[PDB]
Amino acid sequence: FPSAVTIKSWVDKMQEDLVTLAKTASGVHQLVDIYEKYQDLYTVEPNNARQLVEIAARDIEKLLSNRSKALVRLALEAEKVQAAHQWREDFASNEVVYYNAKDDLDPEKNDSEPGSQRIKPVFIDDANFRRQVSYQHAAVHIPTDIYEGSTIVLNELNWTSALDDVFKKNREEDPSLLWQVFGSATGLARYYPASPWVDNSRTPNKIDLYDVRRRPWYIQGAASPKDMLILVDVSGSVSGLTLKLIRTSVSEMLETLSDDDFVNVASFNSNAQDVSCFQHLVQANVRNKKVLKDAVNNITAKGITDYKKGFSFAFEQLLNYNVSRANCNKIIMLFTDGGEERAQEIFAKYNKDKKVRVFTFSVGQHNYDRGPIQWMACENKGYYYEIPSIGAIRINTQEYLDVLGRPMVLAGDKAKQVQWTNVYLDALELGLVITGTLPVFNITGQFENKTNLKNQLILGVMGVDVSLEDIKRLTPRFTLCPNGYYFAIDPNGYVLLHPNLQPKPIGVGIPTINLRKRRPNVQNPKSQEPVTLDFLDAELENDIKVEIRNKMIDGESGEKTFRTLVKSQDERYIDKGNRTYTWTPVNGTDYSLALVLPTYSFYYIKAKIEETITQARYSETLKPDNFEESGYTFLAPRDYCSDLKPSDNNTEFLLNFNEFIDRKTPNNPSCNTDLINRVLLDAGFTNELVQNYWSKQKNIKGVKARFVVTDGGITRVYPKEAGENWQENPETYEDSFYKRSLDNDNYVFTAPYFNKSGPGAYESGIMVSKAVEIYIQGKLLKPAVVGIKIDVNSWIENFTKDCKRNSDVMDCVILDDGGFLLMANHDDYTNQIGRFFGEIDPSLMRHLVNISVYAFNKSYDYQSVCEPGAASKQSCITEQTQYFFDNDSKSFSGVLDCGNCSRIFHVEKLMNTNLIFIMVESKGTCPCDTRLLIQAEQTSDGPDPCDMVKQPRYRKGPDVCFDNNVLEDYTDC
Amino acid sequence: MQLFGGRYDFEDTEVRRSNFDNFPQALISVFQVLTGEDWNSVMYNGIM
């Protein structure tokens, strides 16, 4: 075996050759020089991380205040208009005219429904709505199983017709308004502007299941947070249909809870116990609700009923106060069929002061007495419900919010506070939105206080949608480094804004399907859960990050600079880089906004081109006609102005950009001057680099392609034949290699993909890039990243010319940080290039991890596409692994043994490069193999949910809520 | 009532009026079997 000094000589020669090739081909020094050569076409401006966050927070607060102003207007008008309603019973003579959604648009339909008249809108195409909308009136959605034309429904449509004027007034006051909707307590939903429903009743083979009373915004605005304890009877008498109905009802009621409510499910049959591994109230998020549903759909009916023990258990768990709780609405849901005992002494002992509401549900068809459960219901200020079949479950498991809203009504104007929901997907296909809610009260005979019977219930909930794209417009990012970004947090841990937040629903568990019990014509429900992703689940969790999140949850402003692990955009690498977190609260709301700015990003280049001829030349540099001279050019699809829009097709986008910039002058009456000026300046700089330096050497032996990527969105690949081999995003802020080169202070080798269609191994070559660093006035700037694509064959001749081609004695490979293969020795591993080294030599890779030359750590991706197993695509959790270098030492030596073997290895790290050289005994010498070390997204079900409930994350629930009013009548069950 | 009383706890939503849950219903079922009308359905329910 060769000595250490000989291997040092080999690796020194190899690294010197590679570094010299990259430096003299990419041309880092030339670009740095021409960036420092001018220093007069641009200026260096600071990035004040304090003022920027304050400005963005003020903009967000102003937007949300504007949205909230349109809520009080609608609520007051609705209250005033309904207060002046007559409640007529004869609608045949006086038809009610409205546009019903999810109806056929063919004018020859001749509906002619008694008591109502339909409307045929025009439905022009609009922006900010990826649909066809009409601004002339408002559309009405009625649930399919709720018959329109009833006295209740027709009366609602009669007095809700006055909301269209306020809808139009709000839209004209702020033309950026999205859907604004009135969710009626009778099931109706009137929204503006009018738009056809996504799912018709029965026009296609699919149907819709949409009740406005079950929407998260309606539930949030209809009552206060709850401390719910579902009590389930599992005695022998509930065996049969009623047990299945009880399970379905419990799941449906669990679906009505949010992250501000706390729930636990208990069962009793002569003895009371929990149904899962929780043992106390839990936050009732997606994971906890999934666990509770899985536990509930496993109960069996056996034994003798005992209401005293069950109610004692429920009250004791409601009296805990040791754990996190909503601490607002202590309510008990009792699911049973019938009985003969009312447990008066238990209620007298535990609920004498009547601080706990008891809702009782009689489920199924049976001959058992229902009197005692009605007494329990309307004795402890509750309500009594009956669920005889599946069709009544949805309606009867959502009505309890009417009783819970009585103290909120009796509070008066103190309860009319605008609340904002979690991030969820809009039902009308608008993306990720948040909704501001405002309850509407029934005030009939308010000046005289005549009835006050039904007035204890709300009329409905106001609603206004705000798209997350609107908030992103208030936090511009193109003046920052591609590693910098904004993000906002709830007082619950969930992110309102994050680069890792995606429109996909949050996955829970592992998806399992039973294709043998699926009819082809059923239209199974899709989803209704919100997109609640925690801050610690959107980034790599760190001890300092937990402290920052806790500090900024409870309305504090601060700043922190520290070292953290940063994951690459493609989940394959982890880097170490400095970051600065600057956060401030938003005064109007409970949100908190933070800005993450790394070093070398406190300054940016602002273009200062003020000569028409120079701008014209820079604009004509990026023309398709001279792609043979200036190289293949890409442009980032940024929003330069509304006249031209991104198209996800770079050729036509570049053509439109050129034609727009040449047709009208760059004076930009309504275009962003800074973005265009930066684009022109960087295009001119790249063209100068290409012409003055790259064009001198048309063909280079070891170089297959040469590219330059800068800020502003200019990408050039010098050979046009290599332009079609470029598979990167034209938007430079989404280039993973760009950010990786920005973080690292050396040359970065990007491993090609594997098992991917298209030329990505041999016809393209390995990509190495370096970040361009300039010094203007002692300020560090990294405006551009350049690199080359080296030929694989040229590298093979470099490497082989011990370590010999197809050697049966010695194995010699080259890896980058992350464990991916870039060079081999046997022409067998070379074909499978870009693979994780653990998938082609698991023993050596595992030993390398053990000796601490390679570090790794895992994380969970909660928004992933998964193939459903057996117990098209569904959403679940995938566990990701990324490997990286940890130790600063350059050389390692040792022997690994596997079944009375001994293989001598000596790994060496190449200086000024993220590469490593490994020289090991041939695997054929010792045919040992335990199991592959897979580095890929693996479907996972973790983390364990009822272990995190014992030590949950820090939380800060709402402080103001309404319950237990003295004026409540509570004479109903 | 001793044999089939309380044993018709089927999870499906199908309704079986001719059962032996109490004395009047058991009497009605026995009379129906006595008349011979649809007694095989009662026998199938008892078997299942």
Ligand SMILES: *[C@@H]1O[C@H](CO)[C@@H](O[C@@H]2O[C@H](CO)[C@@H](O[C@@H]3O[C@H](CO)[C@@H](O)[C@H](O)[C@H]3NC(C)=O)[C@H](O)[C@H]2NC(C)=O)[C@H](O)[C@H]1NC(C)=O
């Ligand atoms: C690994 O492959 C490399 C290319 O894929 C080879 O690199 C070439 O090596 C030549 C000799 O070292 C270089 O010639 C020198 O070039 C520099 C500037 O480029 C001149 O200043 C020197 O005068 C010149 N040498 C002489 C004797 O004139 C090539 O330039 C260089 N190729 C590139 C693109 O830079 C390596 O040689 C090869 N490794 C081995 C061990 O052969």
Ligand SMILES: *[C@@H]1O[C@H](CO)[C@@H](O[C@@H]2O[C@H](CO)[C@@H](O[C@@H]3O[C@H](CO)[C@@H](O)[C@H](O)[C@@H]3O)[C@H](O)[C@H]2NC(C)=O)[C@H](O)[C@H]1NC(C)=O
């Ligand atoms: C709910 O439906 C009722 C009935 O269609 C609406 O009431 C109608 O309101 C209009 C507007 O005021 C009335 O027109 C006026 O009639 C008086 C005579 O009564 C006339 O002097 C005026 O010049 C004007 O034409 C209309 O008569 C009235 N209908 C009835 C039966 O009273 C009501 O407006 C609807 N609710 C909402 C919120 O729109």
Ligand SMILES: *[C@@H]1O[C@H](CO)[C@@H](O[C@@H]2O[C@H](CO)[C@@H](O[C@@H]3O[C@H](CO)[C@@H](O)[C@H](O)[C@@H]3O)[C@H](O)[C@H]2NC(C)=O)[C@H](O)[C@H]1NC(C)=O
């Ligand atoms: C808001 O509250 C008011 C009263 O607090 C409600 O008004 C009442 O509505 C009911 C129907 O829900 C009316 O009862 C009906 O009266 C007619 C006679 O006109 C009768 O024929 C029917 O059989 C039925 O009993 C009641 O008269 C009416 N009271 C008043 C003072 O107007 C109103 O319905 C509530 N709003 C909503 C949306 O429910």
Ligand SMILES: *[C@@H]1O[C@H](CO)[C@@H](O[C@@H]2O[C@H](CO)[C@@H](O)[C@H](O)[C@H]2NC(C)=O)[C@H](O)[C@H]1NC(C)=O
């Ligand atoms: C959680 O509740 C339990 C209720 O048992 C508390 O434990 C009791 O605390 C009192 C107060 O000092 C002691 O006198 C009892 O001896 C304790 N009982 C037991 C079994 O430990 C407990 O303090 C509460 N808080 C926590 C954090 O556990």
Ligand SMILES: *[C@@H]1O[C@H](CO)[C@@H](O[C@@H]2O[C@H](CO)[C@@H](O)[C@H](O)[C@H]2NC(C)=O)[C@H](O)[C@H]1NC(C)=O
């Ligand atoms: C709105 O938020 C801003 C955040 O910058 C607050 O501005 C500072 O708040 C602190 C806290 O008391 C004051 O000591 C400073 O004097 C404020 N700065 C300025 C320039 O006035 C601001 O106070 C918040 N608004 C309200 C009403 O609290």
Ligand SMILES: *[C@@H]1O[C@H](CO)[C@@H](O[C@@H]2O[C@H](CO)[C@@H](O)[C@H](O)[C@H]2NC(C)=O)[C@H](O)[C@H]1NC(C)=O
């Ligand atoms: C991410 O990887 C880092 C490795 O740098 C992990 O940090 C190490 O954690 C172990 C176990 O607690 C410690 O013994 C080491 O001292 C840590 N290294 C450093 C540099 O602090 C980290 O735990 C990983 N994160 C996750 C979530 O797995």
Ligand SMILES: *[C@@H]1O[C@H](CO)[C@@H](O)[C@H](O)[C@H]1NC(C)=O
């Ligand atoms: C809020 O409204 C005012 C006036 O209606 C307007 O000037 C301002 O630009 C609005 N702000 C936002 C963020 O929409």
Ligand SMILES: *[C@@H]1O[C@H](CO)[C@@H](O)[C@H](O)[C@H]1NC(C)=O
């Ligand atoms: C991060 O900051 C520390 C402290 O200033 C510095 O020593 C280190 O070089 C920085 N790392 C990078 C990659 O700039």
Ligand SMILES: *[C@@H]1O[C@H](CO)[C@@H](O)[C@H](O)[C@H]1NC(C)=O
């Ligand atoms: C993936 O690559 C391997 C090469 O090891 C090949 O055998 C296999 O057929 C490929 N599979 C697909 C789906 O491309």
Ligand SMILES: *[C@@H]1O[C@H](CO)[C@@H](O)[C@H](O)[C@H]1NC(C)=O
């Ligand atoms: C491999 O890792 C285990 C666990 O840390 C350790 O006990 C063992 O000594 C390691 N083996 C070698 C050869 O480093």
Ligand SMILES: *[C@@H]1O[C@H](CO)[C@@H](O)[C@H](O)[C@H]1NC(C)=O
């Ligand atoms: C690198 O590894 C050597 C031996 O493997 C060890 O002595 C040294 O402390 C390590 N460096 C670290 C942990 O920074």
Ligand SMILES: *[C@@H]1O[C@H](CO)[C@@H](O)[C@H](O)[C@H]1NC(C)=O
């Ligand atoms: C390792 O030991 C086992 C058990 O004695 C033996 O069967 C095996 O042959 C040994 N390995 C080799 C390569 O001989």
Ligand SMILES: [Ca+2]
């Ligand atoms: Ca019972």
